[PDB]
Amino acid sequence: EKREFDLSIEDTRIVLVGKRDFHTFAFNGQVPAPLIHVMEGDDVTVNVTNMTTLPHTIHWHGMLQRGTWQSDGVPHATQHAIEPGDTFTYKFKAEPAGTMWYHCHVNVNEHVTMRGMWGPLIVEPKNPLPIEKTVTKDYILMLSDWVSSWANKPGEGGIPGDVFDYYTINAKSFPETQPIRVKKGDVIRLRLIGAGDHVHAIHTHGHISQIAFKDGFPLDKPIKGDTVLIGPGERYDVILNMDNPGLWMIHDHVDTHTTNGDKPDGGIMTTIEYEEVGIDHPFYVWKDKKFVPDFYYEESLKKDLGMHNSKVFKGEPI
Amino acid sequence: EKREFDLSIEDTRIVLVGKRDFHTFAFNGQVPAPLIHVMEGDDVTVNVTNMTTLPHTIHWHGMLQRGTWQSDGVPHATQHAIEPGDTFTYKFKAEPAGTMWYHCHVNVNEHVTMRGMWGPLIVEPKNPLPIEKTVTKDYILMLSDWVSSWANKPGEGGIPGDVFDYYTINAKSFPETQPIRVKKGDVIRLRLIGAGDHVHAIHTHGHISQIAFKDGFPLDKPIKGDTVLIGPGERYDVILNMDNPGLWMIHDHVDTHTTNGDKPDGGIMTTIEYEEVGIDHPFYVWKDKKFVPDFYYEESLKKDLGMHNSKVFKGEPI
Amino acid sequence: EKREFDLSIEDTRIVLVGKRDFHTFAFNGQVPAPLIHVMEGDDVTVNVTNMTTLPHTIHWHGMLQRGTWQSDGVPHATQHAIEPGDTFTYKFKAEPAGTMWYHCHVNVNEHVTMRGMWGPLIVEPKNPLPIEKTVTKDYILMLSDWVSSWANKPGEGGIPGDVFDYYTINAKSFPETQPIRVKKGDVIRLRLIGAGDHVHAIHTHGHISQIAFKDGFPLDKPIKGDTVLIGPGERYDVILNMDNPGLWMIHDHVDTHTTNGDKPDGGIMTTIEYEEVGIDHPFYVWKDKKFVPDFYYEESLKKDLGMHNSKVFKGEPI
Ligand SMILES: [Cu+2]
Ligand SMILES: [Cu+2]
Ligand SMILES: [Cu+2]
């Protein structure tokens, strides 16, 4: 099916945690960028208007671009970069299927690492595997690493001597992430995307992690474990059978990724909450938490195929 | 079977190498903590008494905690932290089988990374696989990374700007590690545990590394190679057929992990010594080494199931 | 067959990119060291003459050294280091087959990390697998990370505090690497060698990466993806079917590995060029590039088995 989407690139303020804000060059003014959810084989057109003062592109990471290399989105290799004020059109077939993503390919050490120029590109297989068909809830987790010294210095950063100090899932750090809420008998798919500069070791308590897909491609047999080491650019789809009611941590097991600046108990961390046990526990950090749906695109993935903006991810224009 | 153990948490001084000491919050005053060696399906009870001045927990990494989530050991999620002077009891079934471990889950960027709050939990399968039955000697290697600027500053550390400078197997750096002593025909199992903040690349000379288990679970077929990339929280069991008499290095292949402070020839490094070739070689660093048995818990793993303390790992009370 | 090679170790100046030179201890005055290309089972002799003022060895990484441990090349373990002015002879069988390499084993934090003391050791199998027989072009990419502050301070470096700032394929950074030139129907084998201190995440646009070998050993089935996480010491052979004409980036997806000093658009990066689409494009960085053959040993690997020096990699004597 033919599908046509429009994206703008806007100077945008976001807040990672507390008072830690950041200047971003955000697609449709949100970080992560809009979800693009299409069927394997769809013919996609994207029109990208640059409303910032710096050049950009969009590269579609995981798209083979068969016969369409001039839409690969690499400045000085497949196109002239999109200059401020200009519009560029990308045209490609959505293939192969799987957890893909898209990001700017200009000055990546700054733009992708710390300017939020990334979003998920989910391509549905025409014929999903049996394991895919057991999934009841589908989550996207984009992992990023930020250097706060460059928070309000657009056009700069991503250089030797940088001190990484904030770590996010979908551009929020714990305790401002959202819980993953389930019931016994659910099967969840965690689509982990290595959007950052660091390796992350994603560990889930109380459950068997079934690493079932790498870079969109199904593994011969899922690998069982409890910690998934994921590097920059990689994607892993982890399937978890929700057979064990409780309150359960999901976090980066690299301990320096669980801090917010110099404070512990932050960074890349959330929880799985089963409705069977409830959250009314005197010790529980999130007993009084106001839940925000769609923080992992888990509701938007249930909508009709297309591009989905998010009020959850929208920042403030600069 | 029902098994009941006691642990204290004590302020403890350990020495990594030479004159490099560290302040630790040690389980039973030792680092690594006591070996817990039990059968799959055993009902384990652990009474934990906090004799330090900071709060702690024990998380049982790899234990599914089926129906026992309140024993998962996460402060502000599954319990209130164990306050100084108090005793908390963990109750869980030992499952699944494999190389597991335990560690504090309070302020992990400090407590786990640099206060030695970790030990091995070995759960024997009721029906071991054929490859496991070939094993003649079993070794536990826990890999850690230390920041010496915080050595004597308990309650501080694990923050942006930290400079890692010491690297250990079971809390010692080379040359104060111990040789792995074998004879031709032996089959050894190295249980590698990523207790640290960094990825380690464990390389063994003269032999084929058979990567046979990840996070306790058997891989469909062992992966053959010579270098095992292991990240924080992961465990890998590597089986080696001892068919090649000589003196053989095993070391982290990340070169910055083989230094003691700014001196070369240290960190995560030991040798494999075959009795056939002997150690009487003029060039050999360890020709006159005082051998310490049980440095990899290789002697304790042969004893009756239960908890094993060791004077080898015991520090000095602070 | 019996094969005998000579290597000198010489103080040598190389240039990574632009004006960024480095003092190296180079085998035959080149970095990477000469290609050794032999058949599985060949009996190799290497006479190594030290013409520098520091001690060195050569370790043959991936060589089992069955019965030949005293040729393993580890100082203080299998030999006395080779002193200045001295000659040491290594004798071993070339086994097993695969992408192996060789490097000094003295003060590796300096000598291997930043003194260029490494080269490829390709051992051809007697009976290649069906996937190996589909390969039309064979490339060697040795990945390194450098600390420029020690560039001209031989005998120093590789210590806590170091700031890594240059990243290379075969001792050159983009834009001074060379394009990989193919035609439709080609099948290329990228032999990736983790010669550096860092993990690298090698990402190829427009093609499916088939990760087919680890540490020289064939994987049960190739793993499909687009990004290969490769750690220090590891080797991965990636097979790519060239079925998609275009100009395509290959680069390290850790974004801080794509900078030269504090400048973007450098580091571990090159392109694949299909002859069908040409290079005459106004936006293309390398439209006017002077192509230098054998930058990936792609020509030398086609020559008769033996040792191959390279003018491309030759530095200047110091
Ligand atoms: Cu951009
Ligand atoms: Cu603690
Ligand atoms: Cu050397």
From TrEMBL, chains A, B, C:
<protein>
    <submittedName>
        <fullName>Multicopper oxidase type 1</fullName>
    </submittedName>
</protein>
<feature type="domain" description="Plastocyanin-like">
    <location>
        <begin position="14"/>
        <end position="127"/>
    </location>
</feature>
<feature type="binding site">
    <location>
        <position position="117"/>
    </location>
    <ligand>
        <name>Cu(2+)</name>
    </ligand>
</feature>
<feature type="domain" description="Plastocyanin-like">
    <location>
        <begin position="170"/>
        <end position="261"/>
    </location>
</feature>
<dbReference type="InterPro" id="IPR045087">
    <property type="entry name" value="Cu-oxidase_fam"/>
</dbReference>
<keyword id="KW-0560">Oxidoreductase</keyword>
<dbReference type="GO" id="GO:0005507">
    <property type="term" value="F:copper ion binding"/>
</dbReference>
<feature type="binding site">
    <location>
        <position position="104"/>
    </location>
    <ligand>
        <name>Cu(2+)</name>
    </ligand>
</feature>
<keyword id="KW-0186">Copper</keyword>
<feature type="binding site">
    <location>
        <position position="111"/>
    </location>
    <ligand>
        <name>Cu(2+)</name>
    </ligand>
</feature>
<dbReference type="Pfam" id="PF07732">
    <property type="entry name" value="Cu-oxidase_3"/>
</dbReference>
<dbReference type="GO" id="GO:0016491">
    <property type="term" value="F:oxidoreductase activity"/>
</dbReference>
<dbReference type="InterPro" id="IPR011706">
    <property type="entry name" value="Cu-oxidase_C"/>
</dbReference>
<dbReference type="InterPro" id="IPR008972">
    <property type="entry name" value="Cupredoxin"/>
</dbReference>
<keyword id="KW-0479">Metal-binding</keyword>
<feature type="binding site">
    <location>
        <position position="56"/>
    </location>
    <ligand>
        <name>Cu(2+)</name>
    </ligand>
</feature>
<dbReference type="Pfam" id="PF07731">
    <property type="entry name" value="Cu-oxidase_2"/>
</dbReference>
<dbReference type="InterPro" id="IPR011707">
    <property type="entry name" value="Cu-oxidase-like_N"/>
</dbReference>
